[PDB]
Amino acid sequence: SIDVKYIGVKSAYVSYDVQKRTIYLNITNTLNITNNNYYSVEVENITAQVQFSKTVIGKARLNNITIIGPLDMKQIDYTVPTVIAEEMSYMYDFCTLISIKVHNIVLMMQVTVTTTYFGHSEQISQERYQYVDCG
Amino acid sequence: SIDVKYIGVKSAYVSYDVQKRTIYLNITNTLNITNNNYYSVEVENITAQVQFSKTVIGKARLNNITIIGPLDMKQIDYTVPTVIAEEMSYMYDFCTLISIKVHNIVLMMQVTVTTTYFGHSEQISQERYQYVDCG
Amino acid sequence: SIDVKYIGVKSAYVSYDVQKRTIYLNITNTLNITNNNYYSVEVENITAQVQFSKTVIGKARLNNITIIGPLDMKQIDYTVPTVIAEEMSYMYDFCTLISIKVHNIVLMMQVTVTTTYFGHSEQISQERYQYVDCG
Ligand SMILES: *[C@@H]1O[C@H](CO)[C@@H](O)[C@H](O)[C@H]1NC(C)=O
Ligand SMILES: *[C@@H]1O[C@H](CO)[C@@H](O)[C@H](O)[C@H]1NC(C)=O
Ligand SMILES: *[C@@H]1O[C@H](CO)[C@@H](O)[C@H](O)[C@H]1NC(C)=O
Ligand SMILES: *[C@@H]1O[C@H](CO)[C@@H](O)[C@H](O)[C@H]1NC(C)=O
Ligand SMILES: *[C@@H]1O[C@H](CO)[C@@H](O)[C@H](O)[C@H]1NC(C)=O
Ligand SMILES: *[C@@H]1O[C@H](CO)[C@@H](O)[C@H](O)[C@H]1NC(C)=O
Ligand SMILES: *[C@@H]1O[C@H](CO)[C@@H](O)[C@H](O)[C@H]1NC(C)=O
Ligand SMILES: *[C@@H]1O[C@H](CO)[C@@H](O)[C@H](O)[C@H]1NC(C)=O
Ligand SMILES: *[C@@H]1O[C@H](CO)[C@@H](O)[C@H](O)[C@H]1NC(C)=O
Ligand SMILES: *[C@@H]1O[C@H](CO)[C@@H](O)[C@H](O)[C@H]1NC(C)=O
Ligand SMILES: *[C@@H]1O[C@H](CO)[C@@H](O)[C@H](O)[C@H]1NC(C)=O
Ligand SMILES: *[C@@H]1O[C@H](CO)[C@@H](O)[C@H](O)[C@H]1NC(C)=O
């Protein structure tokens, strides 16, 4: 993961952020640039060789080699009564982003209950922009 | 994952963000650029060789080699009564993004209960923009 | 996943964002650019060799080699009574994006209960734009 970037307003290799009142003139700004990037990553050469009970040559009664489980998860239990029992909102809004009593859930799961798993996984997750940009 | 980017308003390799009042003139701005990018990633050369109980040559009674389970997940249980028992909203809004009592859920799952899985998975997830841009 | 991008308003390789009052003139802006990109990714050369119980040569009574399960998921259980028992909304709106009591669900699943799975999966998920752009 080479560039996990979080630039705030903006990114740029070569920028001229000139943004208030600036009489500027007769500039030469010669720019030779050689920005080579090389990426030679994640060269897996693996030989797992994953094996159960290779050679029971004779008479070996085997039993219960791999008991995974039993198991529960029960991950998300809000259990939120919220018995206000007198609501008088009287809610005057102006140009406000306003989230009320919302349940934003992003449950991303992968590679669950898999005996074996080679190679690789990847879970990216962007989040909301939500730009009012009011007057 | 080379560029997991989150640029805020904007990205640009070579930008001129000139955005207030700026008399500018007679500039040469020569730009030689060689931006080569090379990506040579994820070269898997794997030999899993995944095997159960290769050679029971003789008389081996085998039993219960791999008991996965039993199991439950029960992931999302809101259980949200919300018995207000007197609602007088009286809700005057102006140019407000307003989420009320919404349940945003994005349940992304993959590769579940798979004995074996080679290669790779990938779960991207963008989120909402929601740009009011009011007056 | 090389560019998982989230540019906020806009992206551009070579931009001139000139957006307020700017008398600008006699500029040469020569731009030699060589933006070669090479992508040589995900070259899988795998030999899984996935095998159960290769050679029971003699007399081996086998049994219950792979018991996956039993199992439940029961993922999404809102269970949201919401017995307000006096609603007087009186809801005057102006040019507001307004979500009320909506249940946005995006359940993306794939590769479930598959004994084996080679190659690769991919789950992208965009989200809503929802641009009011009111007066
Ligand atoms: C910019 O260049 C011209 C030409 O060489 C020169 O006459 C002028 O004086 C320069 N600008 C200023 C503000 O002096
Ligand atoms: C520009 O940079 C490249 C790379 O280093 C070089 O080969 C070339 O001679 C340079 N040219 C000038 C005019 O500086
Ligand atoms: C991968 O490993 C094998 C086993 O030793 C070897 O013969 C081969 O040269 C290796 N290749 C690379 C690119 O590492
Ligand atoms: C193997 O595991 C199961 C799981 O509970 C159990 O019921 C059984 O008795 C075990 N076998 C032996 C021989 O103990
Ligand atoms: C821009 O260039 C012209 C021509 O060389 C020059 O006469 C002028 O003075 C320059 N600009 C300014 C503000 O001086
Ligand atoms: C521009 O850059 C390239 C790459 O380094 C180089 O071969 C070339 O000579 C350069 N030209 C000038 C005029 O600088
Ligand atoms: C992959 O591995 C095999 C086994 O050793 C080897 O012969 C081959 O050269 C390797 N290739 C690469 C590109 O690593
Ligand atoms: C194998 O596992 C099952 C799962 O509960 C169990 O009922 C059974 O008794 C096990 N076998 C032995 C021989 O214990
Ligand atoms: C732009 O170029 C002309 C021609 O060279 C020059 O006369 C003029 O003065 C320049 N602009 C300004 C504002 O000086
Ligand atoms: C432009 O760039 C290319 C690539 O580096 C180079 O071959 C060429 O000579 C350059 N030309 C000029 C006029 O700079
Ligand atoms: C793939 O692996 C085989 C087995 O060793 C090997 O002969 C072959 O050269 C490899 N090819 C590449 C492109 O890695
Ligand atoms: C094999 O598993 C099943 C699943 O419950 C079980 O009923 C059975 O008794 C098992 N066999 C043995 C020999 O234990």
Side-chain angles (χ1 to χ4, degrees), chain A residues 30-34 36, chain B residues 32 34:
Chain A
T30 311
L31 280 138
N32 194 0
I33 309 178
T34 303
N36 312 297
Chain B
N32 194 0
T34 303

Side-chain angles (χ1 to χ4, degrees), chain C residues 3-16:
Chain C
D3 299 344
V4 174
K5 212 56 37 163
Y6 210 85
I7 322 91
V9 309
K10 78 180 176 288
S11 100
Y13 194 69
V14 174
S15 64
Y16 302 73

Side-chain angles (χ1 to χ4, degrees), chain B residues 2-133:
Chain B
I2 305 305
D3 299 344
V4 174
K5 212 56 37 163
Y6 210 84
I7 322 91
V9 309
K10 78 180 176 288
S11 100
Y13 194 69
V14 174
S15 64
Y16 302 73
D17 195 8
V18 174
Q19 73 250 65
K20 304 192 174 184
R21 76 232 290 191
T22 41
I23 164 173
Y24 83 99
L25 55 160
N26 320 343
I27 56 196
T28 319
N29 319 44
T30 311
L31 280 138
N32 194 0
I33 309 178
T34 303
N35 186 231
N36 312 297
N37 293 331
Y38 301 77
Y39 299 95
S40 177
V41 318
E42 264 158 65
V43 178
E44 262 88 62
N45 192 6
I46 87 174
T47 324
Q49 232 291 5
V50 169
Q51 182 254 111
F52 286 2
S53 64
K54 198 193 194 163
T55 86
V56 315
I57 312 285
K59 71 223 316 293
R61 63 185 38 51
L62 326 184
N63 194 321
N64 279 7
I65 303 305
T66 279
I67 325 311
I68 309 188
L71 66 160
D72 63 334
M73 310 264 150
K74 298 180 181 181
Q75 307 200 3
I76 310 190
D77 297 10
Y78 281 27
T79 308
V80 152
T82 312
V83 47
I84 293 159
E86 194 76 2
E87 190 167 356
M88 205 277 174
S89 181
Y90 208 143
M91 172 173 350
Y92 169 114
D93 306 288
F94 226 79
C95 65
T96 71
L97 206 143
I98 178 152
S99 303
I100 302 164
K101 302 181 171 85
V102 313
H103 318 67
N104 306 354
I105 306 202
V106 184
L107 208 174
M108 296 194 354
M109 60 176 297
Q110 78 167 329
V111 187
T112 307
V113 188
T114 74
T115 323
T116 172
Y117 188 110
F118 308 82
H120 80 111
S121 323
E122 192 170 356
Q123 306 196 120
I124 321 307
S125 175
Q126 311 286 338
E127 259 305 291
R128 314 194 293 284
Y129 208 65
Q130 281 198 344
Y131 97 68
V132 169
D133 195 303

